[PDB]
Every structure is written in structure tokens, then in C-alpha cells.
Nucleic acid binder design. Structure first.
Lengths: 46, 77, 271, 149
RNA sequence: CUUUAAUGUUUGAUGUUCUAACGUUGACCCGUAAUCCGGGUUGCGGACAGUGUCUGGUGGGUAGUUUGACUGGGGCGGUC
RNA sequence: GUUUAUUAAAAACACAGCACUGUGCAAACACGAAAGUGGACGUAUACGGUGUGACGCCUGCCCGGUGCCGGAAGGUUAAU
RNA sequence: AGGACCGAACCGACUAAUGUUGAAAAAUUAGCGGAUGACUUGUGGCUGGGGGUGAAAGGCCAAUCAAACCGGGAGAUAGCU
């Protein structure tokens, strides 16, 4: 309903993606951060 | 950008200041204008944006002398 | 014609609508239809620029021409239907040359009219020609700023403009607002008036009637906070202050637009 | 700067003449139009020894052009030529009447003029008539031609 | 020498016209079985619009800040 | 009809309707270092703003101040 | 024909009662309004922070909107506790 979260799988892959964020320079700082932190969990980048 | 290329003259953030000398800027900029220049060698119009102080300096070395040096920092496509 | 929808229901209480006989439906030729027509008022980089835009029917844009370059063998006028994408009634014209051209249906029709445009045309309302073959005092619609630019003003319902002068270089016209402006003598334009005049004579009847006309309600400032627009101060209301735009300039009077170039071609500004 | 002239146009020039000129003639008149070359102290010797050949053998068939500059800044012609009046006979085809254009114009909106009385424009010896429109009901016929200085 | 005339003349006004600058949000061609774009060709406007620098005027439009203190609570009044 | 999501749903907002005002397309205007974009592939019976609110009957008096607009002729006066 | 009536679905919340160390970070229960259009609803897309968006309340923007979230500047500074 008024719930903040409820799944839309598409959007995750295409807005929070590996390559749906790689283009922007800033969403390459994110990758850089989360690689050197040892982060490799992946927030749905597949 | 917004440069002369010839003299290279570019936007600086200078200020005329205030009268109580408070912090404020508005930028001093060059006089870039497209003036219709043409090569004779390849015989076509190669219109460049260049400043009007830049223009004085083009005149002073000879028009096709600054243009003799150009095409080693060329801009044309 | 214009017909009152008599009190029957509230919002039907008082309605003016227009029904006219020329409305004939069959759809214009597919190559002369494209797309939808809803915009929303947004830039092409997102974010609505212009408020009061959104709403309205689906529509289709209808691909129109009033330039009328052809001067070949006379034509004929086909159907007529109200073109939704503009403020006047249209008719498809078919040249016998093999051309299809739109016209904004100027009054007095035979639905088979012989359109020719020349340098004397068929000399009847509804033919385009270069504005020098007319006398002064003509009514002209699809006046243009350069020849081959095509129609662009006096292209609504019953908009046309009087030729006041046209001797020597340049043609002065009196635009509908008192405004004399001298345009080139080379420019085409159509003889006679433009058709439809019931655009003004349809004065709706309800709030909902206006919503589906592509527009959203215009909210007055004085019923909105200082910050949102001055003259408010809600709870108990407030009043004061010389009336301002949201851009802070005075709305009452305050003549605008100078460019010192297109202004050199305007000869007498408005009353 | 300074220039060696290549022309005689307006009230200055004389088909080669080292004079001082300003930056209203350079980047605004003579140049850019091929109607001058700088004079520096190198040029001053090159061009001058050169100009007693060029500005002689060439000069006396080009006199049309030199003349028309004055005639069109004052205005009394709408036909122009770079050769015409330099044999007793006129040459060219420039002129509103038969180029189907409007030229030598900088206030007048027109872009067409129709041909009326066939005589040729700079193709018949002597003056010819040019007819110039401002409407299809208002006109301004005139008698114009280009001759030498 | 003036008053004033004319010659050698200088220059600002206006006036006119022009392109040779410079713009084109007119037409056409070609790159191009790209309505984008450029150049070319033509027309138009035209030393103008306009922009750079400087400048006066305006400018709660916008910004940063301030707008004291005493006091039988503070206000309020008086006071310094 | 819309509304203070989730204590205030109305006498609030909105509204057809009225009036004023701006604006001739390169429109007013608006957005964006800009290019350019929206307005509109519309175009004065249009597009935008302001105030009032079906309908009916009506909408008096006052332009000084202030703003805005017109007249600026002349005088004052900056940069230089 | 109808921003038409009554009235399910559905969309929504004005009253009251019960709940308030709840079944619930707004419900349950019983009424109620709208209910063919200024309707309402799915999917995706497009708008962003002093901004959007707003039939306009300074409302709404991820249980945050008359003051967003995340990280840093930073040990900001606290004549105060």
C-alpha cells in the first residue's frame, strides 16, 4: 500500500545495476568505494 | 569551453569588488566572436572564434603568420 | 448553431455549446495523421516548465499545410471536420495535380471549391498569393514574415488583418490589437477571411468542460501564501501591495519586448 | 597599419599607392575584398617593384569596378560590373532584371524583379533599362549601366 | 584677422545609401535513399541587432547580517 | 468537484462565468553558464499573467499620494 | 443527454464507539461519501533539495517535508548544564 518497499525487480537491475550506474562518473566512485571496502555483497548488480 | 585558442584568452573569476570590499565576483571574460577567415591553400571558409585583443595581435605578426603557426593546434574538422 | 442546454441538472444548468452542419467524419488520409498530442508542459530534459498543461483528450496531430506552393490545375474541397490541434475548422483539399493541402475552411463553400493559387489566383477568399496583388483594406489570413516560411499569424478562428498600406517598399498591416507593422511585399498570404467564428461563441458551461480542453485550473495568487505568490496571508486573509507577477514585475501595464530589430519593422504600437 | 593599394575605390586609392590606412579599411573594407596587401618594410619593396607590371597590364580592363563603388554608395545604379565600359561595350550579366534577384539593396525588402523591355543588361552597347519592383502595382523603372572610371 | 564670404580645409550631427564587415529564427543544392548540423548558392537584415570590458541608474529580485542595556519577571514607562 | 497522507474535508481551494493587463512568433514569458528547450510544430476567437466567482440586478464618488503608463521639450548630472 | 438520481464492486474518510505496557507507527466495528466521470486503476517511463510537486494546506516528496537522506568539513561553537 503506503509501504516504502515492495518488490520491482526490474528497476533494481536497471537503476542500481553494475552497468545501469557505470556510465555516470559518480556511480563509479560508488564501485570504487565498494570494492576497496571489501564489498562484494552486491546490491543487485546482476 | 570558451577560449581564444590564438592567444588562449579564457574566463577568469575576477571581480570588480564592492565599495566596502565585500566578497563578490562576476568574472572578466574575453571578446570571443566568429570572424570569417579562409584558407587559400585548401580554399574554403574556416571561421574562427577569437578575441578582439587577439585580433590586434593577429594583425601585428601578420594575419597568415599566426595562421601560418595554426594547424599545429588546429581546430578544423 | 449555438444552442443552450436548458436547466436539467446542476452543471447543465447553464451550458452553451455549438453544433454545426459541416462536421462530416470519415478520417483524413493516414499519411496526414501522426501521433497523439499530449505534451504535459515539460522540457525535453524533464520537469514541467509551463504550468496549467496536462489533461485533455488523446487527440491526434494532423499534418497540415497552408503554404500552398502549387499553382496547377484547380482542386476540390473534400470533407470537413474540426481539427482539434488548432483553433479553426479544416478541410482537406485534393488537387487534380496529385497534391493534398489543408485549408482552414473559409466561409462560403461548395465542398468542391476550385483552389488555385497564383499571382492573381482564382481571386476568391481561400486562395494564397503574394501580397502585392491586393489593394488596401483586404482581409488576409496566413500572413508571413518571409516567403516560403508559410502561414503563422491570422490562423485561428476569424483572425485576419487589414492591409492598411502596401505602396512603395514594404506592406503595413493592422494586426488585431491595433498594431501596425510593416512586413515584406514578397510574402504570400491568403485572400479573404479564415473560416469558423464559433470558437468564441462556445463558452462552455461547467468546470469539468474546461478540464478536458487540455488545461488544468489556474489557481489565483492571493489565495496562496506570500512565498508562493504575494497578496495572501491566509487564516483570515490579507490584502495590499501593487499587483505582481510570480516573476515580480508589474502585471498591469508594463509593456514589454524590444529587440530593436523586429521592433524597427513595427510602425505603430497598440492602444 | 599601412598598405600598398591594389585598387582605386572611394576617394582614396589610385591603383597602387602606399598610404597609411586604419582598421576600418582592414577587416571592414579593402581587406577583406582583396583590395589591399600590407606594407611593412619587406613588402614595401616587393610589391612596389611588382606593381609597375601588374597594376599596368591588368589595370586598364578592370576600371568598371573601381568606378561603381562610389556610384552604389551614393546610389544611382542597381547594375554593377567589374568589366563594362572598358572597350566601348558592356559586359556582365549582373543586374536585378535578369538574375531573377535583388542586389545592391540594404533597406528594400524585395527579392524579385521581373523582366520588362528586352534590351539585355550589360550586353547591349550604351545604356539599358532596368525595371525594379516594390509591388505588382507599384514600380520604379530607371536607366542604368556601368562604365569605366 | 574678426562681422562675413570664399579657397586650402577639420569634424560632429542628422540625412542617404552601400557591403567590404556581421547576423539570419527565409529559399534552394550537396555532403546524405540524416526535416539535426556545416559549407556552397540565393534572398533578407545590415554596421544594426548583439556580445566582451567599463560605467551610471534601477534592483527584498537575491544574499549576508544587524536591530543595545538598566528594570522589585519581562513587557510597558522612564533612563544612559 | 479538489484539500491540511494519519485529529481541523469547511463558510477553505477549484470552478464555468466577469473584468483588466501583457504578448504579432526569433511572441510575451519561462527553463538552461551556453547551445538550446518549453510556450507551439500552436500563433490575437491565440498564448501568458492578475483579481473577482452560476444565475439575476448592479457595480457610485476620488488621480493626489504611490506604482505603472504616456509627454520629456528643456534643465540637472555619471563614466570618459 | 447528464461533472444526473439510487445502489454493489471499487476508490475514499466525515461521525461514533472500541482499542492506545493494541491484532494495528491510524486499525477494528458500525454507519458515511463518491460510485460515468474535474472518474478511477495496472505497467513502465519522466521530474530532486532549497529544488521538485501542489484544484494551493506552507500541503506532499520512502512510515522524515513550515525544513530530505548519505558522507565529510569537525574535536564547528556552547560566557550553558
Amino acid at each position: 500500500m503506503k509501504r516504502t518497499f515492495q518488490p520491482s525487480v526490474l528497476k533494481r537491475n536497471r537503476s542500481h545495476g553494475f552497468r545501469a550506474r557505470m556510465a555516470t562518473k559518480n556511480g563509479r566512485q560508488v564501485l570504487a568505494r565498494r570494492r576497496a571496502k571489501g564489498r562484494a555483497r552486491l546490491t543487485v548488480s546482476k | 569551453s570558451r577560449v581564444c585558442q590564438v592567444t588562449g584568452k579564457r574566463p577568469v573569476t575576477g571581480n570588480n569588488r564592492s565599495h566596502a570590499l565585500n566578497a563578490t565576483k562576476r568574472r572578466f571574460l574575453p571578446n570571443l566572436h566568429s570572424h570569417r577567415f579562409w584558407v587559400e591553400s585548401e580554399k574554403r571558409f574556416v571561421t574562427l572564434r577569437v578575441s578582439a585583443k587577439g585580433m590586434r595581435v593577429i594583425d601585428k605578426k601578420g594575419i597568415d603568420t599566426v595562421l601560418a603557426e595554426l594547424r599545429a593546434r588546429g581546430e578544423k574538422y | 448553431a449555438v444552442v443552450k442546454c436548458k436547466p436539467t441538472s446542476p452543471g447543465r444548468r447553464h451550458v452553451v455549446k455549438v453544433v454545426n452542419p459541416e462536421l462530416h467524419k470519415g478520417k483524413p488520409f493516414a499519411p496526414l495523421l501522426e501521433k497523439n498530442s499530449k505534451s504535459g508542459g515539460r522540457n525535453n530534459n524533464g520537469r514541467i516548465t509551463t504550468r496549467h498543461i496536462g489533461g485533455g483528450h488523446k487527440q491526434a496531430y494532423r499534418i497540415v499545410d497552408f503554404k500552398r506552393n502549387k499553382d496547377g490545375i484547380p482542386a476540390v474541397v473534400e470533407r470537413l471536420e474540426y481539427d482539434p490541434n488548432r483553433s479553426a475548422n479544416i478541410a482537406l483539399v485534393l488537387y487534380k495535380d496529385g497534391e493534398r493541402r489543408y485549408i482552414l475552411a473559409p466561409k462560403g463553400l461548395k465542398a468542391g471549391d476550385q483552389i488555385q493559387s497564383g499571382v492573381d489566383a482564382a481571386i476568391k477568399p481561400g486562395n494564397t498569393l503574394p501580397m502585392r496583388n491586393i489593394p488596401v483594406g483586404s482581409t488576409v489570413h496566413n500572413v508571413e514574415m518571409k516567403p516560403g516560411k508559410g502561414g503563422q499569424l491570422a490562423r485561428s478562428a476569424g483572425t485576419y488583418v487589414q492591409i492598411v498600406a502596401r505602396d512603395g517598399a514594404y506592406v503595413t498591416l493592422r494586426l488585431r490589437s491595433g498594431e501596425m507593422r510593416k512586413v515584406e511585399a514578397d510574402c504570400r498570404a491568403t485572400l479573404g477571411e479564415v473560416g469558423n467564428a464559433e470558437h468564441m461563441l462556445r463558452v462552455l458551461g461547467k468546470a469539468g468542460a474546461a478540464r478536458w480542453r487540455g488545461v488544468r485550473p489556474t489557481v489565483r495568487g492571493t489565495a496562496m501564501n506570500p512565498v508562493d505568490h504575494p497578496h495572501g496571508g491566509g487564516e483570515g486573509r490579507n490584502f495590499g501591495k501593487h499587483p505582481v507577477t510570480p516573476w515580480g514585475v508589474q502585471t498591469k501595464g508594463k509593456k514589454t519586448r524590444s529587440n530593436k530589430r523586429t521592433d524597427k519593422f513595427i510602425v505603430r504600437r497598440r492602444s | 597599419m599601412q598598405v600598398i593599394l591594389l585598387d582605386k575605390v572611394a576617394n582614396l586609392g589610385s591603383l597602387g599607392d602606399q598610404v597609411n590606412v586604419k582598421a576600418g579599411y582592414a577587416r571592414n573594407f579593402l581587406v577583406p575584398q582583396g583590395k589591399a596587401v600590407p606594407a611593412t618594410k619587406k613588402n614595401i619593396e616587393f610589391f612596389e617593384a611588382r606593381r609597375a607590371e601588374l597594376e599596368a597590364k591588368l589595370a586598364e580592363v578592370l576600371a568598371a569596378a573601381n568606378a561603381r563603388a562610389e556610384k552604389i554608395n551614393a546610389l544611382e545604379t542597381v547594375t554593377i560590373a567589374s568589366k563594362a565600359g572598358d572597350e566601348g561595350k558592356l559586359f556582365g550579366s549582373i543586374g536585378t532584371r535578369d538574375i531573377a534577384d535583388a542586389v545592391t539593396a540594404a533597406g528594400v525588402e524585395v527579392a524579385k524583379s521581373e523582366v520588362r523591355l528586352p534590351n539585355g543588361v550589360l550586353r547591349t552597347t550604351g545604356e539599358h533599362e532596368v525595371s525594379f519592383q516594390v509591388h505588382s502595382e507599384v514600380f520604379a523603372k530607371v536607366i542604368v549601366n556601368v562604365v569605366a572610371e
